[PDB]
Design a protein around this ligand. Structure first.
Ligand SMILES: CN(C)Cc1c[nH]c2ccc(OCc3ccccc3)cc12
Lengths: 126, 128, 128, 126
């Protein structure tokens, strides 16, 4: 059982998450500038108040390049539910030394975006 | 700064009943806490949202706060107030849990809420 | 002998594999104890001859089995195996559940798969 | 189906082949139990193209007992390119519950040995 190192973004709108070029990577003080590159993956949630199934707001979780459920996807690969982000000067190499989080040992880092970042309409952290 | 929060994620109600747990159950599991500390209250949070152009009432959410902490930190166990329901396990202490306090959401993530062994939640409630 | 899940299958009508948040996803079984609430879903894929005469896959079915029972009775909880996903209810014992075992359809109907109130499912799956 | 070691490789830059003392050599995996700390390293030499053929430094990959390209080998099995290792407290049972890694959805774990572990000469975790 693995997990993102960070908490999620919640989507309230109808369109997929998308950051402008050069933003989107959560702050992690234990990472280096080389490490600042990854993807957000959508997690869908469904529940049962009597209209059978109700789709809740999707959530989007960040994973460093080369880790997570899509560890094998190269940066920029087109896949539904996957969107790519990177900071200027980050290296296009797998971040196996960071890997993913095991919740039995570490709670998620509160997701925080760098000063001046623009979240698209409808998206909120926590 | 100046951000207070429940230590746990919310129980959302899509049914019509207020939250209620049979006496002895209903406090979420917190591996960083003792059985003395298993006492507190859920508190109701209302919300609206915008479908579009429609002042759309949303599903109530309930948040757990340990006894003596949170928005009703001053209220004693069992005090009657609309939007507040009480919960505790057997053998928990009727003492304020100031050492646990509330969560700083900038500093710590919420604990996803899970009722302990053999605890069901009323119809129309779900964790998220 | 040869046996069956105690429960009817969950069919995957979406691209997403079956998954549940920790604590969630064990089928409701009034004949069962909170100690027993631990197991796995196993994907069963069927092929069929299509109208063009080529084999083609049907929608995958996911069958629940209590821990220590069924086709993967040898696996400990959390084992890594394609087509196997794990579920456990808060406070279930990580012990093999050989006392409840698997079903003989000769003398036992399957229990209609029902998930506890407030269970979050992935898209493509439906909770009756 | 086609899988990979859970860990990055040990590269043999020298002429010593792997060998650890009693109870040493199992990589640090916090998603495993004292029961599981048992398995083998398997050599993987690669060949590269002045226009002749060329060996590179052999890469040793760790596979838990019961898993990998030699999953049907019991502990202590004698085979060229196979070295065996176990921690005190481990079980001599196939660890199919760990299995091997699909790189599509899991990054490699950087191979790390516990403090005090002794390595032969010429061996490095790149
Ligand atoms: C939150 N967890 C602690 C749940 C967990 C309990 N017992 C496990 C055994 C294996 C596992 O994941 C398999 C695995 C992971 C990394 C490397 C090899 C194999 C996960 C778990």
């Amino acid at each position: 059982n693995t997990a993102s190192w960070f908490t999620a973004l919640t989507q309230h709108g109808k369109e997929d998450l998308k950051f402008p070029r050069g933003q989107g990577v959560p702050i992690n003080t234990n990472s280096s500038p080389d490490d600042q590159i990854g993807y957000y993956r959508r997690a869908t949630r469904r529940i049962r108040g009597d209209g059978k199934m109700k789709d809740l707001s999707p959530r989007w979780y960040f994973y460093y390049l080369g880790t997570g459920p899509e560890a094998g996807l190269p940066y920029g690969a087109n896949k539904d539910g996957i969107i790519w982000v990177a900071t200027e000067g980050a290296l296009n190499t797998p971040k196996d030394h960071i890997g993913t989080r095991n919740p039995a040992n570490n709670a998620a880092i509160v997701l925080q975006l760098p000063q001046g970042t623009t979240l698209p309409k409808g998206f909120y952290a926590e």
